[PDB]
Structures are given as C-alpha cells and as structure tokens.
Paper text:
BAG6 is an essential protein that functions in two distinct biological pathways, ubiquitin-mediated protein degradation of defective polypeptides and tail-anchored (TA) transmembrane protein biogenesis in mammals, although its structural and functional properties remain unknown. Recent work showed that BAG6 is also a mediator of tail-anchored (TA) transmembrane protein biogenesis. In the TA protein assembly pathway, BAG6 holds the hydrophobic transmembrane domain of newly synthesized TA proteins to maintain them in an unfolded but soluble state in the cytosol. Similarly, mammalian BAG6, Ubl4a, and SGTA make up a trimeric complex that binds TA proteins post-translationally and then loads them onto the cytosolic ATPase TRC40, which in turn targets them to the endoplasmic reticulum.
The x-ray crystal structure of the complex was determined at 1.85 Å resolution. Unambiguous electron density allowed modeling of residues 1058–1112 of BAG6 BAGS and 94–143 of Ubl4a TUGS. The overall structure of the complex consists of six α-helices, three from BAG6 BAGS and three from Ubl4a TUGS. The structure of the first (α1TUGS, residues 95–104) and the second (α2TUGS, residues 109–128) α-helices of Ubl4a TUGS is nearly identical to that of the C-terminal dimerization domain in yeast Get5 (28), despite the extensive divergence in the primary sequences, especially at the protein surfaces. BAG6 BAGS consists of three α-helices, residues 1064–1075 (α1BAGS), 1083–1090 (α2BAGS), and 1093–1112 (α3BAGS). The tertiary structure of BAG6 BAGS was quite distinct from that of the canonical BAG domain identified in BAG1, which adopts a three-helix bundle fold. α1BAGS crosses with α2TUGS forming at a 60° angle, and α2BAGS crosses with α1TUGS forming at a 20° angle, respectively, forming a four-α-helix bundle. The dimer interface primarily consists of the hydrophobic patch on BAG6 (Leu-1064, Val-1068, Ala-1071, and Ala-1072 in α1BAGS; Ala-1077, Pro-1079, and Leu-1080 in the loop region of α1BAGS and α2BAGS; Leu-1086, and Leu-1090 in α2BAGS; and Tyr-1099 in α3BAGS) that docks against Ubl4a (Val-95, Leu-98, Ile-99, and Val-102 in α1TUGS; Phe-107 in the loop region between α1TUGS and α2TUGS; and Val-115, Leu-119, and Tyr-123 in α2TUGS). His-106 of Ubl4a forms electrostatic bridges with Thr-1081 (2.7 Å) and Asp-1089 (2.6 Å) of BAG6, and all of these residues are conserved across vertebrates. One CHAPS molecule was visible in this crystal structure, and it interacted with α3TUGS and α3BAGS.
Residue numbers in the entry:
A (entry chain B): 1058 to 1113
B (entry chain A): 93 to 143
Write the structure that this text describes.
C-alpha cells in the first residue's frame, strides 16, 4: 500500500513476516513503541528519507 | 544516533535475542522497499491527508 505511518503497525508486520512472537504480549510491545522519543525519531527518519527521494 | 537504535532497545525487552535481530532486519527491509515504491503521486496524496 504505502510507507507505514504508525511505527507500532510497522513492527507488527515485520514480526509477523519474521515469525517472531513476543516474550511479553503484543499489547506491552506496542505500549513501548508509542513512547514519545521512539515515535518522534521514527517521524523524523521518515520525513528525512521522503525529502531525499523527492530530491530527484 | 537513530530510530533503529531506539527500536532495538524496545525489541530487547519483548523478543528473544535471535527474534529481535530478525525483526529489526525485516523492519529495515520493509521500510526501504516502501521508500522505493514511493511515487510523486503518493507524496502529493500525503500532503492532502494532514494539512
Ligand atoms: C516533502 C513534502 C513537502 C514538499 C515540499 O514542500 N518541498 C518540495 C520541494 C520540491 N521542489 C520545489 C524543490 C521542486 C522544485 C521544482 S521547481 O518547480 O521549483 O522548479 C511533505 C508534504 C507532506 C509531508 C508528510 C506529511 O506531512 C505527513 C507526515 C508528517 C510528519 O511530521 C513527517 C512525515 C510526513 C510523512 C511528512 C513528510 C514530508 O515532510 C511531506 C511528504
């Protein structure tokens, strides 16, 4: 479809493709992925990379 | 420093060592494929969504 805007959904899809199941729970993993620092770093990476590919 | 490093600290709390590494590599691969498929059409549509 497109680049996943929500990091929690990106990780869920990655884990499913890798056949990885959490030691804890998907709910605990997702709570940690929503930490402001983690979400903000992801947003910034995304913004940087999109701009750079746009630079053609 | 990077988002990959922050994500890896989170993964180390919820996945075995082997699984955490596999998940990070799969995530980086999915991400880069997604960027590759990106077109001018998609970027334009993105701007309409938020502002
Ligand atoms: C990159 C574009 C803005 C384009 C722009 O403004 N600059 C392009 C200049 C092109 N040029 C004029 C140089 C062409 C020259 C041809 S010329 O006609 O000049 O000859 C902007 C528009 C909408 C923005 C996204 C959305 O917000 C949603 C989200 C918000 C997050 O926070 C950060 C991530 C994300 C995905 C954003 C990323 C990025 O930020 C986008 C795609």
């Amino acid at each position: 479809e497109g680049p996943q805007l929500l990091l929690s959904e990106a990780v869920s899809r990655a884990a499913k493709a890798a056949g990885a199941r959490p030691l804890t729970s998907p709910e605990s993993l997702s709570r940690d992925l929503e930490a402001p620092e983690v979400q903000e770093s992801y947003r910034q990476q995304l913004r940087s990379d999109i701009q750079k590919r746009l630079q053609e | 420093g990077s988002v990959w490093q922050l994500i890896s600290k989170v993964l180390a709390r919820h996945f075995s060592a082997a699984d955490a590494s596999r998940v990070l590599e799969q995530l980086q691969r999915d991400y880069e494929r997604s960027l590759s498929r990106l077109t001018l059409d998609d970027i334009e549509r993105l701007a309409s969504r938020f502002l």
